C-alpha cells in the first residue's frame, strides 16, 4: 500500500501551493543529506495508497552547468526512491516549462502532469497534450483547489508512460551517447544510461559524475564529433526545443 511520489516543477509554478493542498498539516522539514538545502516531505492518502510526497526544489531543468536545485532533483530522480512523479506545469508558460517535462519523460520515470494556472493562461487541448507526452495531464484551478481528486485517481491508476520517441537528435549524438552508455555500470537501466550519455554531451556536470566509468571518455566523444557537430550541447537543447515547439503548436 505505500507509494512515494516526487513533486517537481519550475520555480514560481505553484508547486508549494499544490504541496500544501495535498498534505496540509502532515509535513516534515529537514535537509537533503550532505547539504544545507531544505528538504520538505509530506503524507496523504488516496483511494488505494498511503502516499509519501517528497518536494523537490524548484528547477528549470535537470542540467547542471551556484544552484544545487538541478543537481538535487536529478540525483533524487535517478536514485529510484520515487515510484512516480507529479510534474507541476504552468499552462501559461509551456515554452519554458516543457523543457523540464521532456527531460523527465525521456528519462522514463512514470509521470502525471498537474496543469496549473489554467485561468491565468491561451487555450490548451489537454487531451492532445496528454497524447503528445505519453502521460496523464490533470488540470488544476488551485485558487479553488479543484482537481486534487482527479490527481489522486491518476496516482492510483498510472503505472507507466506511453513508450514514445519524443525527441529527434542528430545521429552522431545518439551514436556517441550510446558509446558512453556502454561504459556505464550495468546497475543503471539501459534507458537511463542513454539519457545520461546525452546529458553528458549537453554539459551536465552531475550526470557526468553520476556516470562514473565514462566521465573520462567525454573528451574523446567530443573529438569524435569534432568531425561532424560543432556544438554538441547546443544541438541537444535545440533538438528538445524542436519538439517543445511542435507540441506547443499542436495544443495551443
Amino acid at each position: 500500500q505505500k507509494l512515494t511520489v516526487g513533486l517537481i516543477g519550475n520555480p514560481n509554478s505553484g508547486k508549494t501551493t499544490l504541496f500544501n493542498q495535498l498534505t496540509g498539516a502532515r509535513q516534515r522539514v529537514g535537509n537533503w543529506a550532505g547539504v544545507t538545502v531544505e528538504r520538505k516531505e509530506g503524507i496523504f492518502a488516496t483511494t488505494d495508497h498511503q502516499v509519501t510526497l517528497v518536494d523537490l526544489p524548484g528547477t528549470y531543468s535537470l542540467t547542471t552547468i551556484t544552484s544545487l536545485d538541478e543537481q538535487i532533483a536529478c540525483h533524487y530522480i535517478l536514485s529510484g526512491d520515487a515510484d512516480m512523479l507529479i510534474n507541476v506545469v504552468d499552462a501559461s508558460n509551456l515554452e519554458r516549462n516543457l523543457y523540464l517535462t521532456l527531460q523527465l519523460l525521456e528519462l522514463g520515470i512514470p509521470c502525471v502532469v498537474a496543469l496549473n494556472m489554467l485561468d491565468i493562461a491561451v487555450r490548451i487541448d489537454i487531451d492532445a497534450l496528454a497524447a503528445r507526452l505519453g502521460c496523464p495531464v490533470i488540470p488544476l484551478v488551485s485558487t479553488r483547489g479543484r482537481g486534487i481528486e482527479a490527481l489522486k485517481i491518476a496516482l492510483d491508476r498510472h503505472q507507466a508512460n506511453s513508450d514514445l520517441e519524443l525527441v529527434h537528435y542528430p545521429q552522431p549524438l545518439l551514436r556517441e551517447a550510446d558509446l558512453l552508455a556502454q561504459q556505464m555500470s550495468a546497475q543503471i537501466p539501459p534507458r537511463q544510461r542513454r539519457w545520461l550519455g546525452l546529458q553528458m554531451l549537453e554539459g551536465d556536470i552531475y550526470s557526468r559524475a553520476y556516470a562514473g566509468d565514462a566521465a573520462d571518455k567525454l573528451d574523446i566523444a567530443l573529438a569524435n564529433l569534432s568531425d561532424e557537430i560543432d556544438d554538441p550541447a547546443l544541438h541537444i537543447a535545440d533538438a528538445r526545443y524542436q519538439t517543445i515547439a511542435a507540441i506547443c503548436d499542436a495544443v495551443s
Binding site: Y60, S61, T63, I65, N93, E95, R96, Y99, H168, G203, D231, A233, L234, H235, A237, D238, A239, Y241, Q242, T243, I244, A245, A246, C248
Partner: protein, 63 residues
Amino acid sequence: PLGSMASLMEVRDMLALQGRMEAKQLSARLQTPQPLIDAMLERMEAMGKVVRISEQEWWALRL
C-alpha cells in the same frame, strides 16, 4: 531537422552575425513566436552561450 523552424543554432548564428539584437527582432527576422524565442534565449543563457544586456534587452553571444 524536425520542422522548418527556429533552431537554437539559428538564433546563435543570427546573433553571431548581427552582434546584438532585441528579442522582438529575432522573433520577426526568424519568423518564430515570441514566447518560443524568449524561452530559447533563457535556455542558451543558462548554458552560458548568450548574455543578456541592460541598457532594454540586448542579447548577444558569450558567457
